[PDB]
Ligand binder design. Structure first.
Ligand SMILES: *[C@H](O)[C@H](C[C@@H]1CCNC1=O)NC(=O)[C@H](CC(C)C)NC(=O)OC1CCC(F)(F)CC1
Ligand SMILES: *[C@H](O)[C@H](C[C@@H]1CCNC1=O)NC(=O)[C@H](CC(C)C)NC(=O)OC1CCC(F)(F)CC1
Lengths: 298, 299
């Protein structure tokens, strides 16, 4: 039985309508056009020559509104400011199709949708999970900076990510819209090292619940590890503090397999699956959220 | 090292603007609005009771233009109605102002396409699937999802290729092409129907192994080769599809320097297990990434 648990993204149409190209002398990349404001990464100010140690404050000073060209494929610039790792460009035309939106900073374990763009043209969408080491996976090539990540609560779009860089290990990171870089990485072309990843406990729990709702509940025993103990246990086993949620609880009351049963399960299962499968996997999966499971097996 | 090889969908905006809701008495599901035409699954005509063998030829005659309500959320007047296989072709009196350039082409097994899952005319999610050789897809579809559509995009042209119709007992799904045929010849009757045996999509498996080589993980490549002809007759007896090359596979061979026939030999050896080794994080072969996927996502 295919559970129907898949990596599902939000319909991107709302966001497509905001994507623009931002050009500065010789660099080009994507930006996000909301009302009168175009957001893009500041390293568009930086020529290739000087990417390992750019002086962003001097670059900005050296700039004028006419340094920035903004074009829309899928506009005159009349203001320019810096906010952390991002540029805030004021343009004379407000985006009509600006959707209701907000800015949030997502925390490790949360999923969001990414609209990968190149040269202002949206080319692909996919879902990622913000790892505990504040990187994400996904697919980003040269020219993808400016691509944006978002959730939806309603028709309200919560913009959470603007893509900036690929680490040496092939994972990725970017800015939240307050201008800070997830995981404190620097926007410089300089070797930098991710912290060690961990497992998102809450997401593992939600996956084992899916398994139960799909009629694959063999791993379920009446042994129950208390929360704070599993927490202690995890600090030493590369696992995240487990925090319950209304979403998680809802899952226990549809399965009748309360959480702590599963925390215990995680311990015995972390060792190994001892010959058996869970939803066609022999390792634990942590990229499905409480919310995905409710939404997708309802 | 993270390949960057992930399940990627096309941006859905083009298709979101074509999605409507179609109502016929008690049945409600999604429809696709292109120019003056609204397409939707024909079992919207069927009352909940008659669904296990309905007489679609007589439901259709019993219907007038007023028997169908069509609402745009993301109301339209039906001025004609016709049946094309398992789908309805309704005419409405307003041309969709957001119709994208488009074609109707049926996909073959192993091809991937994007799905826009919709409930009551409202797009809720998008994901990518692979048409299996048993003519089923996986994905996520709930009560109300019928009429959700699957599509690719080449240039400015959307190719519409799927309109969702049903879930099978094993939890997989199927529907029809926009020429009206059902993939796999399943019927739009509410009866237990058994799907054919699955198989591995040899061309996609090759693509994945090229993807591994591009990611640096080439430990499985030997000089040894097995020829296309010779691979396909081995395939028949081992649950694999015929391998057919494409220009897309050829680019991967040219780029890596590894010939198709080396990877066909590797597939015969890796089928029985990896013996403790991994490939792109897997201990078994992946066949749901296409040559086109790999060229796009690694280049
Ligand atoms: C902006 O489009 C681009 C996105 C990168 C390019 C390849 N994949 C991506 O995600 N970002 C950069 O080019 C940045 C620029 C600095 C100023 C932030 N460079 C970058 O990511 O540097 C990486 C260091 C390690 C590496 F060599 F493996 C790849 C580039
Ligand atoms: C149309 O919206 C609906 C979509 C199904 C419902 C659950 N998941 C889906 O993808 N299609 C149907 O309900 C069809 C209708 C007939 C007339 C073609 N029937 C159907 O899929 O029934 C399934 C049989 C076995 C089952 F119970 F496991 C799931 C329902």
């Amino acid at each position: 039985h295919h559970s129907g648990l898949v990596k599902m993204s939000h319909p991107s149409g709302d966001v497509e309508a905001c994507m623009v190209q931002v050009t500065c002398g010789s660099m080009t990349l994507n930006g996000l056009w909301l009302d009168n404001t175009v957001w893009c990464p500041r390293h568009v100010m930086c020529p290739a020559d000087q990417l390992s140690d750019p002086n962003y404050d001097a670059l900005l000073i050296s700039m004028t509104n006419h340094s920035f060209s903004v074009q829309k494929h899928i506009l005159r610039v009349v203001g320019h400011a810096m906010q952390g790792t991002l540029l805030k460009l004021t343009v004379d035309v407000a985006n009509p199709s600006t959707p209701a939106y907000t800015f949030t900073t997502v925390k490790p374990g949360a999923a969001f949708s990414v609209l990968a763009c190149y040269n202002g043209r949206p080319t692909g969408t996919f879902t990622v999970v913000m790892r505990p080491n504040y990187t994400i996976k996904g697919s980003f090539l040269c020219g993808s900076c400016g691509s944006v990540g978002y959730t939806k609560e309603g028709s309200v779009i919560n913009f959470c990510y603007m893509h900036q860089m690929e680490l040496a290990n092939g994972t990725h990171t970017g800015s939240a819209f307050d201008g800070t870089m997830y995981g404190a990485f620097m926007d410089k072309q300089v070797h930098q090292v991710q912290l060690t990843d961990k497992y998102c406990s809450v997401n593992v729990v939600a996956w084992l619940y899916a398994a139960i709702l799909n009629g694959c509940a063999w791993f379920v025993k009446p042994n129950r590890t208390s929360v704070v103990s599993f927490n202690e246990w995890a600090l030493a086993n590369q696992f995240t503090e487990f925090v319950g949620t209304q979403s998680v609880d809802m899952l226990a009351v549809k399965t009748g397999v309360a959480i702590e049963q599963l925390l215990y399960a995680i311990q015995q299962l972390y060792t190994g699956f001892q010959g058996k499968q869970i939803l066609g996997s022999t390792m634990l999966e942590d990229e499905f959220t409480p919310e995905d499971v409710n939404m997708q097996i309802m």
